Amino acid sequence: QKQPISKLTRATPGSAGLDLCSTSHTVLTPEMGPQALSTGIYGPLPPNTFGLILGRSSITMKGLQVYPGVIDNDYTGEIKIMAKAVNNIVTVSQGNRIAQLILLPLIETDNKV
Amino acid sequence: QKQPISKLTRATPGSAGLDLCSTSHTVLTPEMGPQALSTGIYGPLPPNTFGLILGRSSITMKGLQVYPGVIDNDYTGEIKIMAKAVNNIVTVSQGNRIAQLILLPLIETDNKV
Amino acid sequence: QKQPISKLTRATPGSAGLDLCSTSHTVLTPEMGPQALSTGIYGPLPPNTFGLILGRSSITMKGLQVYPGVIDNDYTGEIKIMAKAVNNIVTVSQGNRIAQLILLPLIETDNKV
Numbered sequence: 001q002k003q004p005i006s007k008l009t010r011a012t013p014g015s016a017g018l019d020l021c022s023t024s025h026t027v028l029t030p031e032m033g034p035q036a037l038s039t040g041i042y043g044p045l046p047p048n049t050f051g052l053i054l055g056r057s058s059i060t061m062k063g064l065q066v067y068p069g070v071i072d073n074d075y076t077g078e079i080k081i082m083a084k085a086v087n088n089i090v091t092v093s094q095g096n097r098i099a100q101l102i103l104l105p106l107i108e109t110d111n112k113v
Numbered sequence: 114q115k116q117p118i119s120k121l122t123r124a125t126p127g128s129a130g131l132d133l134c135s136t137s138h139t140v141l142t143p144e145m146g147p148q149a150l151s152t153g154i155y156g157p158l159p160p161n162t163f164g165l166i167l168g169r170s171s172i173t174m175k176g177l178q179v180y181p182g183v184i185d186n187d188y189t190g191e192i193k194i195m196a197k198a199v200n201n202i203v204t205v206s207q208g209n210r211i212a213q214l215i216l217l218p219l220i221e222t223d224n225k226v
Numbered sequence: 227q228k229q230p231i232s233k234l235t236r237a238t239p240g241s242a243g244l245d246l247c248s249t250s251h252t253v254l255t256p257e258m259g260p261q262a263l264s265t266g267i268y269g270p271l272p273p274n275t276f277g278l279i280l281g282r283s284s285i286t287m288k289g290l291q292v293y294p295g296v297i298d299n300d301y302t303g304e305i306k307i308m309a310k311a312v313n314n315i316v317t318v319s320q321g322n323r324i325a326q327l328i329l330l331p332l333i334e335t336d337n338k339v
């Protein structure tokens with residue numbers, strides 16, 4: 001079954017991000033370029049917020065780049081992590097925390113849709 | 114003529130980002146490194162906000178990395194997209210939506226200027 | 227001695243970011259992959275805020291990629307800049323402004339810790 005964002009956990013009370021884990025074992029090589037890693041977690045977001053997926057610094061330092069991703073407030077699909085091995089072969093084990101979801105205020109503007 | 118940020122459009126009502134298109138046809142190769150793509154859109158931003166330029170996930174997944182860029186509230190120059198082809202040759206057609214502008218609250222602090 | 231975030235400066239009144247400088251001379255090559263650059267600046271952040279470390283566009287355009295980093299509200303360690311030379315050899319002189327700290331509201335949620 002789909003899991004909502006309310007199922008995510010914070011590492012600590014003062015952690016800005018909600019941790020995102022891949023649900024698959026994935027191996028990445030630099031030549032593969034960007035890959036979208038499955039999380040089994042689904043939008044949408046709390047009212048008046050949007051999300052940003054960012055890397056965890058310990059993962060970034062281990063050579064896996066998470067490309068910052070914008071999660072729209074009303075996206076109801078699966079939140080995937082866009083990732084690339086920078087220089088070396090990187091192996092993601094199932095359940096490893098690979099990224100984090102940050103929630104931010106969605107500012108209203110009069111821009112046309 | 115310069116176009117202001119109010120001319121940008123959202124893909125959907127609940128889209129966090131305002132789409133940014135290049136005004137030129139540009140081809141990018143990995144060896145070129147970061148390139149600043151013209152948009153013909155100009156700051157400044159709404160009061161008490163700043164901007165962040167981020168990639169669109171469909172573009173990121175096609176091998177074009179947009180480096181997150183900070184747009185200062187009172188910048189009045191042209192908003193450019195900083196982009197790099199990750200692994201392969203990437204071709205941007207004129208008018209293609211390459212990035213998105215997210216607006217965020219500008220927090221005041223007492224840090225010196 | 228440790229320096230707090232209140233010691234950072236803005237380039238201009240309307241600058242979104244607080245500039246971060248490396249305290250060391252560092253040379254980076256693409257094959258080195260991500261490196262954590264010392265700043266001598268320490269958390270924590272103002273109440274109800276978290277931080278984001280982002281690149282300065284002039285530095286990004288010179289071939290040094292700063293990986294976006296999340297600074298937790300209650301982190302009390304040293305803020306380091308995660309950086310990689312994209313394509314060429316990059317040299318950071320001591321005191322050069324390499325990145326910027328953006329402060330953002332920390333939204334409360336009921337996610338478990």
Ligand SMILES: O=c1ccn([C@H]2C[C@H](O)[C@@H](COP(=O)(O)NP(=O)(O)OP(=O)(O)O)O2)c(=O)[nH]1
Pocket residue numbers: 011015017055056057058059279293294295296297298299301304305306307308
């Ligand atoms: O660019 C950065 C990013 C993070 N940091 C520090 C501050 C942040 O609060 C701390 C933890 O960052 P992340 O949560 O992104 N890293 P990770 O998930 O790997 O560690 P933790 O589980 O402790 O949160 O690392 C930096 O100094 N520079």
Ligand SMILES: O=c1ccn([C@H]2C[C@H](O)[C@@H](COP(=O)(O)NP(=O)(O)OP(=O)(O)O)O2)c(=O)[nH]1
Pocket residue numbers: 053067068069070071072073075078079080081082124128130168169170171172
């Ligand atoms: O890292 C990400 C980024 C986006 N997404 C999903 C959520 C987001 O709302 C949706 C659309 O993202 P973008 O707007 O960044 N992509 P794009 O502009 O390519 O598609 P769209 O036109 O639908 O907005 O893709 C992820 O799952 N992971």
Ligand SMILES: O=c1ccn([C@H]2C[C@H](O)[C@@H](COP(=O)(O)NP(=O)(O)OP(=O)(O)O)O2)c(=O)[nH]1
Pocket residue numbers: 166180181182183184185186188191192193194195237241243281282283284285
């Ligand atoms: O992706 C971007 C990032 C920045 N910019 C413009 C807007 C921003 O206000 C201006 C300055 O950006 P940064 O502060 O990130 N660059 P830098 O520190 O190199 O210049 P400055 O000292 O003037 O702030 O560059 C873009 O057009 N696209």
Ligand SMILES: [Mg+2]
Pocket residue numbers: 011015017056100
């Ligand atoms: Mg963390």
Ligand SMILES: [Mg+2]
Pocket residue numbers: 124128130169213
């Ligand atoms: Mg979009």
Ligand SMILES: [Mg+2]
Pocket residue numbers: 237241243282326
């Ligand atoms: Mg600056």
